[PDB]
Symmetry: C2
Subunit: 220 residues, 2 copies
């Protein structure tokens, strides 16, 4: 409820979006407090002194930090609602593994295209993103087992962990002039991404591409 669940967030953040989608799945209402560009609020600094990052879930006045940990916490506290994590230990380990991969390696590589200077660096950064999408496509085929989502019949942990970046992916495609996730290159992910963005827990917390692209300009 808004009385007992607060989320320190910011609408462009893919990490924050993970927390919002998961709360939606669990039918948990919450208040969302927006951070402003270029400064961290005193409330954020107080609630996440270690990292000073969003999201922060404040549940009954206790702060929980790090989006993937927050997603676990929401799944575990609100355990009677639809499950986010897979039920099987091996499946769980694999979903956790790919989410950690996305944060550690994949997402940082998106930004690397804009940062690259010169043709060899640009080609390298663009090629890397393409190679990783090929890996993620293969992984999707393996994990989904023919079902609509990474998590099976309904969105799960890995859908949320990857799908939270789709807005920034689309912006990166616009600015790089290369389409990475599409029918030709990643036909399975292409169908999945339409379904994911149409999911009622996702549809209104996923930023429209041009709006995010405008924000990307305001960014410095």
């Amino acid at each position: 409820a808004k009385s007992d669940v607060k989320l320190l967030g910011a609408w462009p953040s893919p990490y924050v979006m993970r927390a919002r989608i998961t709360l939606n799945v669990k039918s948990v209402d919450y208040e969302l407090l927006e951070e402003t560009l270029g400064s961290k609020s005193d409330l954020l600094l107080k609630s996440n002194p270690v990292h000073k990052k969003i999201p922060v879930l404040i549940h009954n006045d206790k702060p929980i930090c790090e989006s993937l940990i927050i997603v676990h916490y929401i799944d575990e506290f609100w355990s009677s609602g639809p499950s986010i994590l897979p039920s099987d230990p091996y499946d769980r380990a694999i979903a956790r593994f790919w989410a950690a991969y996305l944060d550690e390696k994949w997402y940082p590589s998106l930004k690397g295209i804009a940062s690259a200077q010169g043709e060899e660096a640009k080609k390298a950064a663009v090629d890397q993103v393409g190679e990783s999408l090929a890996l993620i496509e293969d992984t999707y085929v393996k994990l989904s087992k023919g079902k609509p989502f990474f998590g099976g019949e309904k969105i799960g942990y890995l859908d949320i962990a990857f799908g939270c970046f789709l807005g920034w992916l689309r912006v990166t495609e616009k600015t790089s002039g290369v389409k990475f996730l599409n029918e030709a290159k990643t036909p399975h992910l292409a169908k999945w991404a339409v379904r994911f963005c149409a999911d009622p827990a996702v549809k209104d917390v996923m930023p429209e591409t041009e709006k995010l692209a405008e924000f990307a300009k305001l960014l410095a």
Copy 2:
């Protein structure tokens, strides 16, 4: 068993040690395959193509990667054995949070002392480690609630996540000439570290300090 559980490891690795301690707690026997310095084995390259890192747990011929995920997997698959993760959702989130902090921020800062050039850089790196130990000491007091371990009566997730680094901490103290974890500065952690290293799941997989210090020399 050795037939169905293999661990790609290396005796100096704190990350690998997490997997060994957890298997020990669960009374799960396993075979350990050592990586050699300066090269990755073809078996490692095949079992962890994404990161090419140890540890890798190969359980019934399925590889699982990333030490903290491996610790979760062992806890969850071997669920009838002593529990590693806390039972409460909030406690779980907090233990996960501090383990992630240790890997992201704390452990990298240990190496920064040796890497620093000049007095201002050295002082900065040494001071940072001291500040973080003060934070970890406070966290220990809060989480342990007077019990011997972060996890309470028995070693738990966060004991394993922090304690796995004690060998490298002692080596860093030797090479930096500054003691960071001791009675004077961190009296609670000082008592805890003796108890942790004496635990039967830890005692023989924790490298003796001089041996690790010698390895640190062989390192380039």
